[PDB]
């Protein structure tokens, strides 16, 4: 829970620093970028003709909402799949903005369904990804269903078809995340069962903005020293754009100020970048303006003391 940084590094961090707290002290800026995206945004028709997979009959129950779908040309491939009709269909998306291996790739992906958890599970295997971040509670307080539990085994040991699912352990922190360590395998036991970390944040509300940035910055500092290498960080909430672009867009943007690419200090452009990836990334304009904070709070955090 503490970087060693070089003196590029921290220099880098500084010129950061700088600009985003100015446009934190000139909102109007902020809110201008944001309108200006909103302008641009893709209209739902395109996706009859970029997310064709997603839209077949076959595949249209596996999507919680009939407007947030991949596209065919970043989507994540189940490969083996149990259907070929199916073309190997999950709601999933590569958000990848550098090939670096100090700069995470990420699997944008929705709340899985009762009836998508096997596909999930599938898609962690053959990914090897090793970390989960989930954005969402299970059920909002209007009582509306926002995420399968795919994940909880109070009762004992998980099942998805050929996949079996186990808690190692639990452990809360100081800022209401829940960490669980959970082993993933299938049931021929060729190999060494699989470790995945999956975080919960349940203070982020549906289509809103936490309080302050503590927990989700606590998110970044747990990640910080987990290689890029090791595979995609899954990261979910309930459509898998709203939370989830806000949370990779803060991710993505430290690691590619601490990897020296100045295109990080345009947070629009990164937002942009990321809807050509996965359509609607970061819903609101709250949620804009809390990825400038959630920045501003780090890079004071990455400099205190410098």
């Known amino acids: 829970s503490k970087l060693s940084l070089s003196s590029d590094q ?3 961090c500084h010129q950061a620093l700088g600009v985003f707290r100015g446009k934190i002290q000139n909102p109007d800026s902020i809110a201008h970028e944001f309108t200006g995206l909103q302008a641009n945004r893709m209209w739902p028709s395109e996706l009859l003709l970029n997310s064709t997979v997603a839209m077949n009959s076959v595949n249209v129950e596996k999507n919680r909402y009939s407007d947030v779908v991949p596209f065919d040309k970043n989507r994540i491939v189940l490969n083996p799949c149990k ?3 199916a073309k190997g269909y999950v709601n999933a998306s590569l958000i990848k903005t550098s090939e670096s291996e100090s700069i995470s790739q990420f699997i944008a992906t929705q709340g899985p369904l009762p009836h998508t958890m096997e596909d999930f599970w599938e898609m ?13 509670r299970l059920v909002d307080n209007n009582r509306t269903v926002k995420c399968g539990d795919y994940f909880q085994d109070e009762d004992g040991p998980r099942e998805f078809g050929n996949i ?27 190999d060494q069962p ?17 309080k302050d940035t503590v927990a989700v910055r606590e998110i970044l500092k747990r990640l910080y020293q987990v290689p890029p290498s090791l595979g995609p960080i899954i990261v979910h909430c309930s459509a898998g754009i709203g939370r989830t672009g806000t949370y990779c867009a803060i991710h993505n943007t430290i ?18 970048l990321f809807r050509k990836q996965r359509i609607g990334m970061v819903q609101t304009m709250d ?16 400099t205190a003391g410098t």
């Open 287 to 302: 949620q804009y303006f809390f990825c400038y904070n959630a920045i501003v709070d780090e890079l004071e955090d990455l």
């Open 194 to 210: 699989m470790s995945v970390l999956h975080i919960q944040y349940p203070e982020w509300p549906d289509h809103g903005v936490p």
């Open 255 to 272: 690691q590619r100020i601490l990897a020296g690419d100045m295109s990080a200090l345009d947070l629009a452009k990164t937002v942009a």
């Open 10 to 12: 921290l220099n880098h």
């Open 83 to 85: 259907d070929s009709s």
């Open 164 to 190: 079996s699912l186990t808690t190692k352990w639990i452990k809360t922190t100081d800022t209401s995340l829940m960490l669980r360590n959970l082993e993933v395998n299938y049931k021929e036991t060729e």
């Open 124 to 136: 962690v295997i053959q990914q090897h990804c090793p970390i989960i971040v989930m954005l969402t």
